[PDB]
């Protein structure tokens with residue numbers, strides 16, 4: 001038996017845990033801005049976080065600092081996407097979202113941004 | 120803002136969380152049922168079950184690394200439900216239906232309980 005709403009229900013509940021700061025186990029720092037999250041959700045969405053949270057050096061760190069070129073607004077848009085399946089874009093931030101998704105190794109998001117930029 | 124909906128995203132997240140469970144990556148709790156051990160992610164358990172949600176939101180129990188389920192709970196019934204939590208697939212059959220329904224009632228998974236009731240009535 002297949003429950004079509006199950007995965008979206010799980011994601012909705014994970015986003016509720018994030019909003020309530022329940023079992024968040026990492027702070028992602030982007031140009032001093034802090035983002036509280038679940039390492040499992042981050043690894044499930046990003047090639048970069050899969051690498052970081054399996055990394056012998058970084059796996060137990062409670063704080064991860066992204067490279068200094070990374071845009072905090074771009075990161076916030078992508079973190080919201082990870083937990084909701086909804087990507088919120090504007091003409092003024094789409095390039096920063098694309099650059100962030102490239103860094104986070106989120107190819108389908110990169111491709112979606114790229115196609116919208118060309119359109 | 121322009122809003123793009125990724126309709127397969129939620130399913131891809133769940134698939135990847137199940138892959139982490141399979142490889143025992145970031146698992147932070149062992150659920151013990153009649154001494155049978157089940158490794159899982161607390162957040163996934165909370166997202167699927169009223170019982171787990173109440174256990175890990177409770178600050179006294181939030182950091183427990185082992186949770187023992189009530190003695191009346193069948194490990195096979197729990198295994199079916201744990202697989203459902205991580206896959207959206209519920210493997211119901213005549214031989215396990217009573218045990219699966221009883222476990223879903225205990226775990227407070229009312230949608231699954233309803234599905235079990237429909238299976239018995241069919």
Ligand SMILES: Cc1cc(C)n(-c2ncc(Cl)c(Nc3ccc(Cl)cc3)n2)n1
Pocket residue numbers: 040043044045046047048050105106107134135136138139
């Ligand atoms: C066979 C298989 C294929 C994938 C993508 N797996 C997998 N399993 C678990 C996780 Cl958390 C995860 N995350 C993740 C996401 C984005 C990127 Cl580019 C890389 C890896 N990916 N497994």
Ligand SMILES: Cc1cc(C)n(-c2ncc(Cl)c(Nc3ccc(Cl)cc3)n2)n1
Pocket residue numbers: 013014016017165166167168169170172227228229
């Ligand atoms: C306002 C609100 C509504 C829900 C369903 N919330 C919620 N948020 C987060 C989680 Cl993890 C969670 N799990 C969960 C699942 C099964 C059962 Cl019976 C009870 C609660 N439930 N919050």
